[PDB]
Amino acid sequence: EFSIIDQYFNRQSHPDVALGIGDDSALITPPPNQQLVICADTLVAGRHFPLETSPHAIGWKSVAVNLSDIAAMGAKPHSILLAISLPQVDHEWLEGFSQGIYDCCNQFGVALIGGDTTQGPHLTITVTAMGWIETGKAVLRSGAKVGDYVCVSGQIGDAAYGLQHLGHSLQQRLDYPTPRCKLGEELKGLASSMIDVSDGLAQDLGHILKASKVGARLILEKLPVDPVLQQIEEQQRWQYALAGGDDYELCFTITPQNYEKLLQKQLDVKITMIGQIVEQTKLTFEHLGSDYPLQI
């Protein structure tokens, strides 16, 4: 177990880490005039990923889903803790898994600074992520105002389709979600509210609506879906997009004025306006310019 840490999880720490792996706790010197942003998310084998998922993909997604919650605040990710409960000690598995962890960390300039390694009957992983943001400038789930656009990044429904069609190209969106870190940072001071879409667009937008004490009207034909989902029947397409989940895209609200400023930035991801915030505290849908009753 102590050898497991040294063998797989003790790459040299960044110069930006006061004390990394090796002691009872890690130490971080805060950057000035910034708040600590902190979150944790658990992945349970067979629940948050198929049992047969490659160890590298498990490692990647364990980090990615937590970076997504830092990004959903408009913050910049800094470091993570890794808590893993393992049924067995398998070198090939541990090599792939740790490679997955570090590949995702390195993509986004994040340090692995600590954690815990235990034995347990079922593979269970909890990553804690830490980031920093200019004091007072976090993008909350509250903050959405009547007249704001509702927007979402990338595509929604991919991962859900992937889960139900394993082996299909869209499985890559299930196994390797992309946390939208740079977009989150670019939305600081532009977005009036934000959440990452981890459970499903309707449910997660719903948290914003409830927190902001507003409602929204979405346009079904504007939901950004993969060409593959564009070719399946409407009803199923919209279910994948609205209740699929595991997208790890950012859903946010923004004034038309700030939206124009957003579109003028160089962004590493697609942005789509899918509706607007309204006064009535309900989530409703529009299609071809008419009300569209829809149960999700």
Next chain:
Amino acid sequence: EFSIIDQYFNRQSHPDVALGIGDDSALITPPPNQQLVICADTLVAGRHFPLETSPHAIGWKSVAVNLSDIAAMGAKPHSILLAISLPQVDHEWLEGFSQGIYDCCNQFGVALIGGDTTQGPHLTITVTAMGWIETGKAVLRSGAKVGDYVCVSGQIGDAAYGLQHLGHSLQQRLDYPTPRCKLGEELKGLASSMIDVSDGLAQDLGHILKASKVGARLILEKLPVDPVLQQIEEQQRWQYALAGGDDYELCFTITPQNYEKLLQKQLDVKITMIGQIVEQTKLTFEHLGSDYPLQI
């Protein structure tokens, strides 16, 4: 699961929390001139606690073992995240478990500011603890010097005895360890090195010896054991004390000069000098003034 969070894990925190439970991440405004101290430890049902352990004790210990690693740095604890994987939703269990979480947090002035709640086949808990310490003043596992006293707080072996004698009063030490938070803070500026005894005195002192590139000679009859263990045959007594684990006491090294200073403080726990640091890089034992060969 959203009902669970609201019903059991959403009490108002200390004023020192910029944003607590309810958003994608929590926000903390760092106190000036302090470093973030951060750790995580997992408890797996049946492994880190007997399956029949009361939910209140499970909640208490989940927090306590993590406050212990904050204390082991000399730092002051501030807040925790709670990640729980639950096989079933049981109201009586959740009431007891959450009461245990909050009882430990409240005793030590700690806020529960976030976490994750999931379904899984086996009860698994990971708490992340966050604390703060004056920049540069952490007590590391490195730093022990030849001639330094080796010391330990409280009693060692209680929890291990309790585990093997479930039903005995010493089970209290297994179920309800006390993190030595105030002692940890009082050892800032005095201890030359420190670790908390979670795995066993010999093993955990061993991490200090390895990090400091020194050895130690312990005096077996000076080990602080319960009167109950004083009545056991000495070999088994010393095995509980040196290899029992789950003590969550602090083991630290300290100059004779600084030990005198320590004893002048008003402390909330027993402190015992049990040996001293030596040049040769080995852990050895002495009994009644003679070398005492002992395998842990």
